[PDB]
Design a protein around this ligand. Structure first.
Ligand SMILES: Nc1nc2c(ncn2[C@@H]2O[C@H](COP(=O)(O)OP(=O)(O)OP(=O)(O)O)[C@@H](O)[C@H]2O)c(=O)[nH]1
Ligand SMILES: Nc1nc2c(ncn2[C@@H]2O[C@H](COP(=O)(O)OP(=O)(O)OP(=O)(O)O)[C@@H](O)[C@H]2O)c(=O)[nH]1
Ligand SMILES: Nc1nc2c(ncn2[C@@H]2O[C@H](COP(=O)(O)OP(=O)(O)O)[C@@H](O)[C@H]2O)c(=O)[nH]1
Ligand SMILES: [Mg+2]
Ligand SMILES: [Mg+2]
Lengths: 428, 63, 426, 201, 428
């Protein structure tokens, strides 16, 4: 009955899912070949002599990423038909994955999603991993969600998408891939979680205190977020939550569906001894502005709804004291129309650790998925960079020759500006 | 001098060539092993201490 | 898979391509007789990008060598790695282009057209899908400039939806071999702006000068001159054959560099280029490469970007190295070189972690950059044209093979209209 | 008889088996000669298998594995293009599993002992040295031939150099791996190797 | 007792025949000599000391493959004059194989047909395999159906012919060969099954995904298909639907018996470990509109009837649920006068896979032999290829010099056009 599929589109999707499926395989006692030496139903599928096939698709137009998991140590855990390759890289271009040859990928990707969905007692998740600013992350990410919207109507679309940073972009057309993706991400996905890179390099600076993390240490943290978010479907807990009611818990309005992510406690094994991590202090360590993973200050953003997922030996009564002292604390702004804005779920198992990872073993953990008005300020700075790209029409006519009409930048602009104005009128 | 020429500032070769995905995302019980040889691993107190309550706190769950 | 088609054009192109096929071959670990040696998946799984099979396991490069004189092609069979190429891939000229663009493009090169198409189409359609081309040619002589730009004028309209990278060796302000300099330079470049996807500018005069301070040796032969080019030749396309954390290809490299279709001339440089005395004494790391590749004195082109301003920069780092040490270290160079970068583009750079280091070196970087600093090099070629064209000098050899005074004046007008956007994008 | 009738393994097969069946004849409704199911062999003697550091490994290690002959030559460039690819496929089976699953035995086509060592040190799986006549009699059994010198017995060569082939308990082949064959799937046919139907038992 | 007689005409039919008799002998436990160390009685006779001979005839006007079988592995499984071969190849000429060179071994072929039929009473039918697009497969096949309809009028005639494909047809005169055999298999053949070389090319490159297999692998897939047809004859099961029922339920008109074929799951070596063999998904893939063996798109045609032969440890309940969900899908449609058009003949025996071949050991299988109004498009392109070629007398003098009169060219054209009007009128 419990069943969530994953759709990794883009090099960020394959790399994040590389950490996700190694974390999931070690947690259920699954070897890299797939067979264990009833909670595995929600992420895997039983077949043969206990050998488990993950309900997943690894999609990427270019090679050299998707063949890397076709040649690594996880080749023979995945079904080799959701491993999808093209030949041509989407080339950091939105219209290459949306208006020229990517149809040969999406026409059989819907076939593989249909085949995966005809394996299921009940569907409750559409976890899509991608980068916003990548060419195939925005390009095919737009086309897959519009195809799945008209195919599968009223189900939950999860989406953990990598927003570009305010400071670095690692590209000059990051505004050109962000406003186009958002213009069709408002109407297609249901839950959009913002992720952002040097929020989390700064996380690994002052908390994990290791001198060289990389993109792969980024993905291990994100996999810990997804594992605690969907742990309630796996194991029994004191207060079981469901992914299909995160949809009704967070969003107030049909167009307001952007939330945040933060994980705690995050302390390496050397400094995990001076203090005993209690429930009342991991909540304060997660609610602090320097622990969230999008580097937007919640001091100037009004909180709206908040959901906390617990993993370990935690009783609910010191949870009740912990959420009370957060609610009476003034440095976290709550808005006047919503006095009740907390949903806490509690699960029994302790969080798992990768063997010898930078994360230390801990008896309890909190994941926070929170809706706030501060997303309007992340979006208003990308708003400013889009006009300053469009001031003399730079990098626009290769999009025009790609297949988009010159002028759909205007209504993608007006959808983003309608996103700018409506959080302002909500916050009053 | 070198064994690789002018561009080679020193000698590493292709024998030291793997990727981050191949070197790090190798099988996990293997990754337990070579790290085992190189270093793998209001306050509330126990019921012994006479801080907060200690009479009825000792009885249902002794510690 | 993704196929790149290489062309050697002119004497300079043949010699600079010979060294590049030596540095790619031992980067993949391949004996020059064709047999692979080195025992690694990671240098052999992507070998079809540049090479082809031979039903013996032998690998032959996808390179055609084309030249109107038999002299310098006989030297590359005579030299090392001469057996590596396919014998059919050579096409011969028995006359010799005598430094004239007219017999390079119109008259003497016309009879070699029906043979050069039949060997480049044979190599192209044999694969399932071509990715791009990559030629090497010089604008100085006749068989490199004229006979080379004739290739661009035909390969584009028969393969329209593809790309190519042309590595053009550009003449010198100070030293001057090939005394008819401005005529061959201008006649190649006005075709090259209209009809080529990007141009990398390579300057001999400056690359003697990198060879005189940072590589500081007294006797520079043409061998290590081309070996310094072949490092950035290899680094600009390293991720086509190699995996990485953040990938890059030629088609992507064009999309996020060129903002407007008439500027595609790019600086190029390779870091590190450490002196022989300084070899052991550099604990090489990301901070010292970033200052080395954002160093004007270390640019292969003879243009100083202190006068210019970088429109968009790009860096393909190579090796086992941290990824945020790319990121906020380039945010440091924006915050310190504020006036050296264009203000209406924020985050002007590429980051690209080619996960495979160069041959022997632990970690490096290859810099390519769209700069407006090339306007001073393009205007000295313009006044070199006009100084010798007012006196009508060295024109009788051109006009005797079907030139025109009219066709020379849209070559200068396209030259001035090429420079024109550079100083008004400052 | 399997997979090829005339081979030095299979003339030793018939000479061994109905010899002990005629031992059973005057010892005692026995039928002569025995059925092909009744013939049984030892494929590798005690002093054949050498691992990486040149120590003997008996036949008892091979139980419950998927063992395949690897017919190869060091100087062959097609073997050069295959050898890393089969190295990767070895470590993915071995490390991705509680018990290491496949096993590759080496027989060589090299010129001399010195060329054999240069190709041997690159290989972690088990190997058979060239001076053993077990190598040459295995050439004529599975029909692997570089250029036709030794007389074939009314046959045409099944493979070319190099060729990997999975085997069974009694010298039979289990399923073919076409890297240079009628399918000629070079450097991709290693994925066709199964391990549910071919177990050396 | 209970036996069938198989006929093979032309070397295409021979290369089918040595493949089906390859699989028939191994699943019955018998050897190339004819010995096994009473379910085999339908395919092999009993002769004294356990030697078995197939109930077949091999017919080919050239010796180029018949005596090559006589030198191959299966020398002594077959009877000596079971393999009948003339000297002269008919060479893509229907007239040559109908008048001059065919009749020298027509009387020889009927003599062996009489001698194998009168061996035991209780014969069910003839299973004829030929090449429509060739010379002797079309011409000598026409005479055998002409002379068997006058001797064994009552007995069944199931045909399996290699019809061409619209893209690749490997010939220049096959429009004349095919429409001249069209006149033969309407009024003589009981039920005709359309096969196609390039559709089985399509299957083996994407489903079992070898880049370059050849004729010898299509022969395995035909051998699997005809095995699953004849399985209910050989082995017991839940429901027994044998070759006398196949025409009772699939063809409702005397002139409408052209009908397709499908096999699922055609599984590669790597695909068998992960993909669980659910009865729900093997029926879905059998009904997949590009998984059949004709290049015959059924999305713009209606379904008359369908038989599903399940082979393995198959329970009938999830069969009934599999045929429940195929009606509830709006993607395919059935014809309006036939709401129930399904058959479920189940046999307990698992499929027999060849070791060293290309398929894997599957626990279950399904064979879909279906009648549809989609014969119209595969015959109307065929009609158009005849129209552009007959209009200028091309390759016409070859046939009229061999005895066939001009005028039989014309009446075969309106014979095909009459069948085209039959399929058009019935789909209303
Ligand atoms: N958090 C995180 N972000 C990533 C990762 N990989 C790439 N990104 C982000 O993705 C952006 C570019 O998109 P990519 O994922 O690299 O490339 P892509 O999705 O394949 O699309 P293309 O540009 O067409 O290749 C970069 O700016 C990165 O910030 C990753 O592993 N983790
Ligand atoms: N199913 C199948 N069809 C084949 C095979 N070989 C040839 N065909 C088909 O047969 C068609 C033509 O008939 P042929 O097999 O060439 O020869 P024929 O029918 O005996 O007529 P002749 O050429 O005169 O001998 C070709 O278009 C092929 O599609 C095969 O091995 N299997
Ligand atoms: N980098 C490099 N430059 C060269 C080489 N040989 C000649 N050149 C330069 O090329 C110019 C001559 O052009 P060249 O290509 O020889 O004329 P062409 O034979 O007609 O194409 C001279 O000014 C040299 O500076 C070489 O081997 N390497
Ligand atoms: Mg990509
Ligand atoms: Mg005939």
């Amino acid at each position: 009955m419990r069943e969530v599929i994953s759709i990794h589109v883009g090099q960020a999707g394959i790399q994040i899912g590389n950490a996700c499926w190694e974390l999931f395989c070690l947690e259920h006692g699954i070897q890299p070949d797939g067979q264990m030496p009833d909670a595995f139903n929600t992420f895997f599928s039983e077949t043969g002599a206990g050998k488990h096939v993950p309900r997943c698709v690894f999609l990427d137009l270019e090679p050299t990423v998707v063949d890397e998991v076709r040649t690594g140590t996880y080749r023979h855990l995945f079904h080799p038909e959701q491993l999808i390759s093209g030949k041509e890289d989407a080339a950091n271009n939105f219209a290459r994955g949306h208006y020229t040859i990517g149809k040969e990928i999406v026409d059989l990707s819907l076939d593989r999603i249909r085949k995966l969905a005809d394996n299921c007692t009940g569907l409750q998740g559409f976890l899509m991993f991608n980068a916003v600013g990548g060419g195939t992350g925005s390009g095919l990410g737009c086309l897959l969600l519009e195809r799945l919207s008209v195919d599968y109507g009223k189900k939950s679309k999860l989406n953990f998408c990598s927003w570009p940073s305010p400071q670095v972009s690692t590209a000059v057309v990051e505004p050109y891939n962000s406003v186009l993706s958002t213009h069709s991400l408002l109407e297609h996905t249901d839950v959009a979680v913002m992720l952002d890179n040097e929020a989390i390099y700064d996380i690994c600076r002052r908390n994990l205190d290791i001198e060289r993390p990389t993109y792969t240490n980024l993905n291990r943290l994100i996999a810990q977020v997804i594992s605690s978010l969907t742990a309630s479907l796996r194991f029994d807990g004191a207060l079981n939550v469901d992914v299909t009611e995160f949809q009704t818990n967070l969003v107030p309005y049909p167009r307001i569906h952007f939330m945040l992510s933060s994980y705690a406690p995050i302390i390496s094994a050397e400094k995990a001894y001076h203090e005993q991590l209690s429930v009342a202090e991991i909540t304060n360590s997660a609610f602090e502005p320097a622990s969230m993973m999008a580097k937007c200050d919640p001091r100037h953003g009004k909180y709206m709804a908040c959901c906390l997922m617990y993993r370990g030996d935690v009783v609910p009564k010191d949870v009740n004291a912990a959420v009370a002292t957060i609610k009476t604390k003034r440095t976290i702004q709550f808005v006047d129309w919503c006095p009740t804005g907390f949903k806490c779920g509690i699960n029994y198992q302790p969080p798992t650790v990768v063997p010898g990872g930078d994360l230390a073993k801990v008896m309890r953990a909190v994941c926070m998925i929170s809706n706030s008005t501060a997303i309007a300020e992340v979006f208003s700075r990308m708003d400013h960079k889009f006009d300053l790209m469009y001031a003399k029409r730079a990098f626009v006519h290769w999009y025009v020759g790609e297949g988009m009409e010159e002028g759909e930048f205007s209504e993608a602009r007006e959808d983003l500006a309608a996103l700018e104005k409506d959080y302002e009128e909500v916050g009053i | 001098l070198s064994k690789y020429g002018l561009l080679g500032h020193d000698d590493s070769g292709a024998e030291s060539w793997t990727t981050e995905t191949r070197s790090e995302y190798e099988p996990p019980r293997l990754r337990r092993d070579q790290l085992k040889a190189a270093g793998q691993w209001m306050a509330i107190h126990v019921s012994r201490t006479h801080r907060e309550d200690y009479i009825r706190s000792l009885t249902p769950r002794p510690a | 898979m993704r196929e790149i088609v290489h062309v050697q054009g002119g004497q300079c192109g043949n010699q600079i391509g010979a060294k590049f096929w030596e540095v790619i071959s031992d980067e993949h670990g391949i004996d020059p007789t064709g047999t692979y040696c080195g025992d690694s998946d990671l240098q052999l799984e992507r070998i079809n990008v540049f090479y082809n099979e031979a039903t013996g396991g032998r690998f032959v490069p996808r390179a055609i060598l084309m030249d109107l004189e038999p002299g310098t092609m006989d030297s590359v069979r005579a030299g090392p790695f001469g057996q590596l190429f396919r014998p059919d891939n050579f096409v011969f000229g028995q006359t010799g282009a005598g430094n004239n663009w007219a017999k390079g493009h119109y008259t003497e090169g016309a009879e070699l057209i029906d043979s050069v198409l039949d060997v480049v189409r044979k190599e192209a359609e044999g694969c399932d899908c071509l990715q791009g081309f990559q030629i090497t040619h010089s604008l100085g002589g006749g068989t490199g400039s004229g006979m080379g730009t004739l290739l661009i004028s035909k390969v584009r309209e028969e393969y329209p939806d593809r790309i190519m990278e042309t590595f053009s060796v550009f003449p010198s302000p100070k030293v001057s071999d090939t005394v008819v300099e401005p005529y061959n330079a201008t006649l190649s470049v006005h075709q090259l702006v209209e009809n080529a996807d990007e141009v990398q500018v390579i300057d001999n005069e400056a690359l003697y000068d990198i060879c005189f301070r940072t590589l500081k040796l007294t006797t520079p032969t043409y061998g290590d001159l081309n070996h310094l080019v072949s490092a950035a030749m290899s680094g600009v396309t390293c991720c086509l054959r190699f995996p990485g954390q953040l990938n890059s290809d030629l088609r992507k490299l064009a999309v996020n560099l060129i903002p407007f279709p008439r500027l595609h001339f790019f600086l190029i440089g390779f870091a590190p280029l450490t002196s022989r005395g300084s070899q052991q004494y550099r604990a090489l790391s990301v901070p010292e490469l970033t200052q080395q590749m954002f160093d004007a004195k270390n640019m292969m082109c003879a243009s100083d970007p202190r006068h210019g301003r970088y429109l968009t920069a790009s860096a393909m780092f190579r090796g086992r190295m941290s990824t945020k040490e790319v990121d906020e270290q380039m945010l440091n160079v924006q915050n310190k070189n504020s006036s050296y970068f264009v203000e209406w583009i924020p985050n002007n750079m590429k980051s690209s972690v080619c996960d495979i280091p160069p041959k022997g070196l632990k970690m490096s970087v290859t810099f390519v950059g769209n700069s407006t600093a090339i306007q001073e090099m393009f205007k000295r070629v313009s006044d070199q044209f006009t100084a010798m064209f007012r006196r009508k000098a060295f024109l009788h050899w051109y006009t005797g093979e079907g030139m025109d005074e009219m066709e020379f004046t849209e070559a200068e007008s396209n030259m001035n209209d090429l420079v024109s956007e550079y100083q008004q994008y400052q | 008889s399997q997979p090829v009738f005339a081979s030095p393994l299979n003339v030793e097969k018939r000479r061994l088996n109905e010899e002990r069946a005629l031992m059973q004849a005057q010892k005692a409704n026995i039928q002569l000669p025995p059925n092909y199911g009744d013939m049984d062999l030892i494929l590798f003697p005690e002093g054949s298998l050498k691992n990486s550091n040149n120590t003997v490994i008996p036949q008892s290690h091979l139980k419950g594995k998927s063992v395949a002959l690897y017919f190869a030559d060091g100087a062959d460039p097609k073997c050069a293009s295959l050898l890393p690819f089969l190295l990767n496929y070895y470590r993915t089976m071995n490390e991705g599993g509680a018990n290491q699953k496949i096993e590759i035995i080496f027989v060589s086509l090299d010129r001399d002992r010195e060329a054999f060592e240069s190709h041997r040190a690159h290989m972690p799986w088990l190997s058979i040295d060239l001076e053993n006549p077990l190598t040459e009699i295995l050439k004529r059994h599975f029909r692997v031939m570089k250029e036709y010198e030794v007389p074939t017995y009314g046959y045409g060569s099944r493979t070319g150099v190099p060729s990997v082939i999975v085997i069974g308990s009694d010298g039979r082949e289990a399923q073919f791996l076409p890297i240079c064959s009628g399918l000629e799937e070079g450097d991709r046919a290693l994925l066709r190797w199964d391990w549910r139907n071919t177990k050396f038992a």
